[PDB]
Assembly symmetry: C2
Homo-oligomer: 178 residues x 2
């Protein structure tokens, strides 16, 4: 029951800081649960991290896919545009601090059940990019290229905050619309 | 040389594992340096990490720029090729574990000492890409897009082991006509 509060509280803290930086004791208080209640739902920190990544996958994929299904009658450039714009909104959102899946691999949060979630999600996004570009109306720029560019656009602004990714994306949208 | 023995030991250990995973005392042992001589050079792990990142920036910037000055008598497309192919070689080393500057930020190393080095280097890299593409011999792809694709290709391989970055680069090199 209080599982969701814990999950949602840990998600924010992991996104805000890092996995190794926030310990279980901090998640306990901020969720306002008893230690015993935490471990009933999450017997270990790795299990909470696994559920945090599963939740991030479910929310990202549902969000993207729902926008695209609003454009099934829009043609293929319109749907590719929406995938690109979605990234603009994602890095401009207030709490954006990078990609949580890239964060887990850099922090070596890579127990097998966690890695499979990470790889399955990024394999889904690679496939989605590839399917959106393998249309007749598209060319020049390859999908493996666009995928890695989007992945590089998900880096924390702190690495290079003068880079405006939205300006690059707006420019690439105009190329598809040539 | 004392200060440099500590650098090479810490810098190597941070890449193999992670900044958080490697403790100052582990660095003391494997370097065989008096703990007081360590603290005369680096009074805090943060100052050590800043120096490690300055060493990494120096190494990468001199490796890239040495490949380009050997190609001064060549064309602009060949010099852009050199930078692209440099990333192919970098992610194919046996000791490759992603980008140390990305890793630092994702591990929440966000002190002023660290971010100023990280950002100076990546600012340097963004300008180099812009300058190598700011030539008469160059398309529908902006330098900001190329920078981001280069950044994304430096992610650890296990985030999605099915992405073949080398093939992506080969095709991108061929769109530039070389």
């Amino acid at each position: 029951s209080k599982r969701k509060t814990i999950l949602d509280t840990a998600l924010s803290l992991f996104k805000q800081y890092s996995f190794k930086f926030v310990g279980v004791d901090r998640i306990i208080n901020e969720s306002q649960v008893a230690k015993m209640t935490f471990y009933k739902h999450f017997p270990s920190k790795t299990l909470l991290i696994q559920a945090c990544l599963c939740e991030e996958q479910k929310t990202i994929e549902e969000s993207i896919l729902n926008e695209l299904s609003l454009l099934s009658e829009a043609g293929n450039i319109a749907r590719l545009k929406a995938l690109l714009n979605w990234h603009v909104a994602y890095i401009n959102q207030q709490n954006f601090n990078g990609c949580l899946f890239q964060k887990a691999v850099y922090e070596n949060e890579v127990s097998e059940e966690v890695l499979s979630v990470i790889q399955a999600h990024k394999q889904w996004k690679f496939k989605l990019v590839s399917d959106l570009m393998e249309v007749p109306e598209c060319c020049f720029v390859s999908s493996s290229m666009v995928y890695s560019m989007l992945e590089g656009m998900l880096l924390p602004a702190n690495i290079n905050p003068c880079v405006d990714h939205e300006t690059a994306i707006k420019n690439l949208i105009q190329t598809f619309e040539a």
